[PDB]
Design an enzyme around this catalytic site. Structure first.
Site, short mmCIF file in Angstrom:
data_model
loop_
_atom_site.label_atom_id
_atom_site.label_comp_id
_atom_site.label_asym_id
_atom_site.label_seq_id
_atom_site.Cartn_x
_atom_site.Cartn_y
_atom_site.Cartn_z
N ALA A 111 51.87 67.79 40.69
CA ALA A 111 52.50 67.76 42.01
C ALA A 111 51.99 66.58 42.87
N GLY A 112 51.49 65.54 42.22
CA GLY A 112 50.99 64.37 42.93
C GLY A 112 52.12 63.47 43.41
N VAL A 126 50.58 64.01 35.43
CA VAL A 126 49.29 64.51 35.94
C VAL A 126 48.38 63.44 36.53
N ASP A 184 43.94 48.79 39.42
CA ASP A 184 43.78 50.13 38.81
C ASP A 184 42.69 50.28 37.78
N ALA A 216 49.41 49.37 44.80
CA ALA A 216 49.72 47.95 44.59
C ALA A 216 49.07 47.05 45.62
N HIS A 232 62.35 51.59 73.90
CA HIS A 232 63.04 52.88 74.02
C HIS A 232 64.54 52.63 73.84
C1 FAD Z 1 75.76 51.76 77.02
C2 FAD Z 1 74.36 51.43 77.48
C3 FAD Z 1 73.34 51.36 76.52
C4 FAD Z 1 72.04 51.06 76.90
N1 FAD Z 1 71.08 51.00 75.94
C5 FAD Z 1 69.80 50.71 76.24
C6 FAD Z 1 68.74 50.64 75.21
O1 FAD Z 1 69.02 50.84 74.01
N2 FAD Z 1 67.48 50.35 75.57
C7 FAD Z 1 67.15 50.13 76.86
O2 FAD Z 1 65.96 49.87 77.14
N3 FAD Z 1 68.07 50.18 77.86
C8 FAD Z 1 69.38 50.45 77.64
N4 FAD Z 1 70.33 50.51 78.68
C9 FAD Z 1 69.87 50.25 80.05
C10 FAD Z 1 69.23 51.51 80.63
O3 FAD Z 1 70.23 52.53 80.78
C11 FAD Z 1 68.58 51.22 81.97
O4 FAD Z 1 67.68 50.09 81.87
C12 FAD Z 1 67.81 52.43 82.46
O5 FAD Z 1 68.67 53.57 82.45
C13 FAD Z 1 67.28 52.21 83.86
O6 FAD Z 1 66.55 53.35 84.30
P1 FAD Z 1 66.42 53.72 85.86
O7 FAD Z 1 65.79 55.08 85.92
O8 FAD Z 1 65.81 52.56 86.59
O9 FAD Z 1 67.94 53.84 86.35
P2 FAD Z 1 68.99 54.89 85.76
O10 FAD Z 1 68.63 55.28 84.36
O11 FAD Z 1 70.39 54.40 86.05
O12 FAD Z 1 68.74 56.16 86.69
C14 FAD Z 1 69.12 56.14 88.06
C15 FAD Z 1 69.52 57.54 88.51
O13 FAD Z 1 69.39 57.59 89.93
C16 FAD Z 1 70.47 58.37 90.46
N5 FAD Z 1 70.66 57.99 91.87
C17 FAD Z 1 71.00 56.78 92.35
N6 FAD Z 1 71.06 56.80 93.70
C18 FAD Z 1 70.74 58.04 94.11
C19 FAD Z 1 70.60 58.76 95.40
N7 FAD Z 1 70.83 58.13 96.56
N8 FAD Z 1 70.25 60.06 95.37
C20 FAD Z 1 70.02 60.72 94.22
N9 FAD Z 1 70.13 60.13 93.02
C21 FAD Z 1 70.48 58.82 92.89
C22 FAD Z 1 71.63 58.10 89.53
O14 FAD Z 1 72.56 59.18 89.50
C23 FAD Z 1 70.95 57.92 88.19
O15 FAD Z 1 71.01 59.15 87.47
C24 FAD Z 1 71.69 50.82 78.34
C25 FAD Z 1 72.72 50.90 79.30
C26 FAD Z 1 74.03 51.21 78.92
C27 FAD Z 1 75.10 51.29 79.98
C1 FAD Z 2 56.50 55.83 39.05
C2 FAD Z 2 55.42 55.09 39.80
C3 FAD Z 2 55.60 54.78 41.14
C4 FAD Z 2 54.61 54.10 41.84
N1 FAD Z 2 54.84 53.83 43.15
C5 FAD Z 2 53.92 53.17 43.88
C6 FAD Z 2 54.16 52.87 45.32
O1 FAD Z 2 55.22 53.24 45.87
N2 FAD Z 2 53.22 52.21 46.00
C7 FAD Z 2 52.07 51.81 45.42
O2 FAD Z 2 51.22 51.18 46.10
N3 FAD Z 2 51.79 52.05 44.11
C8 FAD Z 2 52.64 52.71 43.30
N4 FAD Z 2 52.35 52.96 41.93
C9 FAD Z 2 51.07 52.47 41.38
C10 FAD Z 2 51.17 50.97 41.10
O3 FAD Z 2 52.24 50.75 40.18
C11 FAD Z 2 49.91 50.31 40.53
O4 FAD Z 2 48.74 50.65 41.26
C12 FAD Z 2 50.12 48.80 40.56
O5 FAD Z 2 50.89 48.47 39.41
C13 FAD Z 2 48.83 47.96 40.59
O6 FAD Z 2 48.35 47.85 39.27
P1 FAD Z 2 47.61 46.52 38.73
O7 FAD Z 2 48.19 45.22 39.21
O8 FAD Z 2 46.14 46.77 38.91
O9 FAD Z 2 48.00 46.62 37.17
P2 FAD Z 2 49.46 47.04 36.63
O10 FAD Z 2 50.50 46.76 37.67
O11 FAD Z 2 49.36 48.39 35.98
O12 FAD Z 2 49.74 45.95 35.50
C14 FAD Z 2 48.72 45.52 34.61
C15 FAD Z 2 49.33 44.53 33.65
O13 FAD Z 2 48.33 44.07 32.76
C16 FAD Z 2 48.89 43.95 31.46
N5 FAD Z 2 47.80 43.92 30.46
C17 FAD Z 2 46.88 44.88 30.19
N6 FAD Z 2 46.03 44.46 29.22
C18 FAD Z 2 46.39 43.22 28.87
C19 FAD Z 2 45.93 42.19 27.91
N7 FAD Z 2 44.87 42.42 27.11
N8 FAD Z 2 46.60 41.01 27.85
C20 FAD Z 2 47.67 40.75 28.64
N9 FAD Z 2 48.13 41.65 29.54
C21 FAD Z 2 47.55 42.87 29.69
C22 FAD Z 2 49.88 45.10 31.38
O14 FAD Z 2 50.92 44.89 30.42
C23 FAD Z 2 50.43 45.14 32.79
O15 FAD Z 2 51.63 44.36 32.93
C24 FAD Z 2 53.34 53.66 41.17
C25 FAD Z 2 53.18 53.97 39.81
C26 FAD Z 2 54.18 54.66 39.11
C27 FAD Z 2 53.98 54.98 37.65
#
Ligand code: FAD
Ligand code: FAD
Lengths: 474, 474
Positions: free
Chosen positions: B189-190, B277, B319, B327, B451
């Site tokens: 289960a590793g 294992v 290894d 890796a 955000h």
């Molecule tokens: C489609 C869209 C997508 C956006 N996506 C992102 C994004 O992904 N990431 C991001 O960082 N920004 C995003 N923005 C911008 C983001 O919405 C604003 O920067 C942020 O909401 C500003 O926060 P605020 O609290 O200053 O103002 P607002 O969030 O506008 O809050 C102001 C609140 O004050 C209330 N209010 C105003 N006057 C009065 C009053 N006199 N009395 C009582 N309540 C009042 C309003 O009803 C409102 O609810 C997006 C904007 C739009 C339109």
């Molecule tokens: C299914 C699976 C999934 C994995 N997923 C991950 C992951 O998501 N993330 C992660 O960090 N690790 C993962 N690992 C572990 C990872 O693959 C190893 O730790 C990584 O390969 C580092 O090994 P290494 O470079 O020390 O040697 P290896 O990569 O094992 O390779 C050693 C090489 O040396 C060669 N060799 C050996 N003896 C001789 C010789 N005498 N002459 C010439 N060549 C030789 C071999 O043929 C081989 O190609 C996974 C392993 C398995 C089996």
């Protein structure tokens, strides 16, 4: 019998609700006012992010991607299906369930932390006094020692194509379609437009994205933006740059858009049109004339580097203030502010705020771009690793994109990490963490990375900086 | 005359090939000997990892998961399909193509770096002299100033169920089935048994895992192993602990296995039986009697903490030596060794080698476990975050699992990160990087995380360490 709170938060978005909870965690009697309600008139916390922004877009992006993959990429694995069909109502229903569950969880966090949630419109009067307007036009005034203004933003409305929640819609509406529109137009090639465009394109829509600007994701790295445009055009997004919309005509269930690019004046008809040019900060009835809080020329509330307004004890966070309009930005500002109130000498770090675009391939980055550093006069070393050489990526059948690391030629300090590909957000976060500790390209290249994993692309990228990568020639 | 190399590497696996390339990068005239060939007698680099281990298992795991998801989880997104069928030959054919492509790439890296690859059996004679045995029994002797022994390992063969590459197979055979076995038995289960068992279970096999030990993944955290067993049993893996196999009888296309657990002697019949294992280190004809290299009681080559054998200039990595059979472990030992040969002050850190189990949900961890630190007398602080509260995870429809962070109660230094869930390997790498720079639970909790992203679970986990998490009560 006037109510009294230590902190009053106007708004329940990523900035507002996090702040409220955080204030309660620090022993401050906190109240959070919110006017936004669900489709049954009941309070819904989480703001734009949770209700009509972040979460909803991600839900449809994930569902729409699973459909595209099932139609074209399943054969390769030996997997056959009959015809693959998407029931849009059910796709949108799954999203609604997720939103309902998450909004309920914020309410749960509020109850568990002891936050008094108030449902209504909040307004900042003079002397840190807050006026709450109930549903039946009744008014109550509450007292606060500190106030956190967190009203966020709303979508920009353009004169040539005014939204009518039917043929012409904004981001909110584009998440509610009940059928795939045959012809979908999107105004604005920004993050929001691209995510909304991608969703419906995958479901069979003929998507056209009209961008008035001559650039495409100029904030991103030149290499990342060049790749995103190439990959997104293949996915069915006809991105047209330098195309300015001048007018629209709705006729039944259609709209004829009129635009101007370098070639002249063109026309194109869509079944649905999404306006997504950007977002403006909301301060509608938020401030009384004598509240003392100043608004700027572009609608943002003035604050210093610590999100404090002119008025003592009045802070403003999130989208309603300067900075990147991201949820994680708003949240961090909320925490920074609450700690400041409790007397901590706290100041968040704006230099390492990553950006994420949830298209597929996913795009993300943190730090400075290559082109911004050439203009800044900094000599840099660039290392890249394509996912085409990642064993883990090949296993997943998703090899497109790359990881790009940028370091200073003299110190070797990582100045920026940019990714376009599988798990891009996670790889960029790894970079951000390294940069936080001031990493060098060499530092990352000397660490032990699991094999096989997508994270290795960041490792080979770091080594390639100084020409020491093992899985790509130098 | 006699050929002369600065470094001679016996073995082309993750330890061997990486070392060869790395030695060439540092100006050492390197040669890498390898006896393993593809099905047409031609040299195949990459060792176990690439040819019958890491990559192959991951390919089948990804394909088999896409099939399971298509059968059960698609309706939730509104996606309907006809009957969903898996063509095993094509699934295995995709994997072969991936392996062929990657093996060819290592050869490409060797040519580009200037590594002389030799196809044959290498043997270490006395005086750092290497004997190469060619295909036609011819013998050639090459001279080496340094030798790197990297012969890896092979699967354990047990007397009660001897492998016959048909009804009873080892890991290598379990990756070649041309049909889903109706009844599949797995001994062990590793990590390997669970990955191979998961693949065929998802494709419709009735899988039974007979584990002789009373424990399940004892190297993992108690919480991670308790969750993995629960989730894997639900997926159709009937894991039986304390069940020791005493004998088997092959009859046509069937095998009747006989085992003993606490209840008595039971019998069960399988169509295919996978023996998994563990693995034994390979030293077959690797050393001449007077080479001076000592072998251990369990077959491992003796080496110090720097992979150096008794003989000056003779090193042994991967290894075939002590340590976790991974890796990335082997690779890093290869690099450590080459740098030491060039005179660098290199020294590995075995405490920060992450481990990954590619089941679904994915399992991974780095550092020490909670139970190992209670026995070590170290007072710790534990913070956890479930994916059931991750918005990103809900969007993806994959909410199972959690992130667990462990820090020292006095210093707050992160002593270990453990994850079971989506993108587990990537979140753990974020932890590894942080720990490399000596992070505190507080350091991570103060960073800005995108955000919405899965990375946030690591963020809320770090904050929960010192009772400051926002999205889960403290
Ligand atoms: C489609 C869209 C997508 C956006 N996506 C992102 C994004 O992904 N990431 C991001 O960082 N920004 C995003 N923005 C911008 C983001 O919405 C604003 O920067 C942020 O909401 C500003 O926060 P605020 O609290 O200053 O103002 P607002 O969030 O506008 O809050 C102001 C609140 O004050 C209330 N209010 C105003 N006057 C009065 C009053 N006199 N009395 C009582 N309540 C009042 C309003 O009803 C409102 O609810 C997006 C904007 C739009 C339109
Ligand atoms: C299914 C699976 C999934 C994995 N997923 C991950 C992951 O998501 N993330 C992660 O960090 N690790 C993962 N690992 C572990 C990872 O693959 C190893 O730790 C990584 O390969 C580092 O090994 P290494 O470079 O020390 O040697 P290896 O990569 O094992 O390779 C050693 C090489 O040396 C060669 N060799 C050996 N003896 C001789 C010789 N005498 N002459 C010439 N060549 C030789 C071999 O043929 C081989 O190609 C996974 C392993 C398995 C089996």
């Amino acid at each position: 019998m006037t109510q009294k709170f230590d902190v009053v938060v106007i708004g329940a978005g990523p900035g507002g609700y996090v702040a409220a909870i955080k204030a309660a965690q620090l022993g401050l009697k906190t109240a959070c006012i919110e006017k936004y309600t669900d489709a049954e008139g009941k309070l819904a916390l989480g703001g734009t992010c949770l209700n009509v922004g972040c979460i909803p877009s991600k839900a449809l992006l994930d569902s729409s991607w699973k459909y595209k993959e099932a139609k074209e990429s399943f054969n390769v694995h030996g997997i056959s299906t009959g015809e693959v069909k998407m029931d849009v109502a059910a796709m949108v229903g799954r999203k609604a369930g997720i939103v309902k569950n998450l909004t309920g969880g914020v309410a749960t966090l509020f109850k568990a932390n002891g936050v008094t949630s108030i449902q209504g419109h909040g307004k900042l009067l003079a002397g840190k006094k807050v006026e709450v307007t109930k549903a039946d036009g009744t008014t109550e005034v509450i007292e606060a020692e500190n106030v956190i203004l967190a009203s966020g933003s709303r979508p920009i409305d353009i004169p040539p194509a005014p939204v009518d929640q039917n043929v012409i819609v904004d981001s909110t509406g584009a998440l509610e379609f009940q059928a795939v529109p045959k012809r979908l137009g999107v105004i604005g090639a920004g993050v929001i437009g691209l995510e909304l465009g991608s969703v419906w394109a995958r479901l069979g829509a003929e998507v056209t994205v009209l961008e008035a600007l001559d650039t495409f994701l100029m904030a991103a790295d030149t290499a990342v933006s060049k790749e995103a445009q190439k990959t997104l055009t293949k996915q069915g997004l006809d991105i047209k740059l330098g195309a300015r919309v001048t007018g629209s005509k709705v006729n039944g269930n259609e709209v004829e858009v009129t635009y101007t690019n370098a070639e002249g004046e063109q026309k194109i008809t869509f079944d649905k049109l999404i306006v997504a040019v950007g977002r403006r900060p909301v301060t509608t009835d938020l401030l009384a004339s004598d509240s003392g809080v100043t608004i700027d020329e572009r609608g943002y509330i003035f604050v210093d580097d610590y999100c404090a307004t002119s008025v003592p004890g009045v802070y403003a966070i999130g989208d309603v203030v300067r900075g990147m309009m991201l949820a994680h930005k708003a949240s961090e500002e909320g925490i920074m502010v609450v700690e400041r109130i409790k007397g901590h000498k706290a100041q968040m770090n704006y230099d390492l705020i990553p950006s994420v675009i949830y298209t597929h391939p996913e795009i993300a980055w943190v730090g400075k771009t290559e082109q911004a550093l050439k203009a800044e006069g900094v000599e840099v070393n660039v290392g890249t690793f394509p996912f085409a050489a990642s064993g883990r990526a090949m296993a997943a059948n998703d090899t497109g994109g790359f990881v790009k690391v940028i370091a200073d030629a003299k110190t070797d300090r990582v100045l920026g990490v940019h990714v376009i590909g599988p798990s891009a957000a996670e790889l960029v976060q790894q970079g951000a963490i390294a940069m936080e500790f001031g990493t060098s390209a060499e530092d990352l290249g000397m660490m032990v990375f699991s094999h096989p994993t997508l994270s290795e692309a960041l490792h080979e990228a770091a080594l390639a900086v100084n020409g020491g990568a093992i899985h790509v020639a130098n």
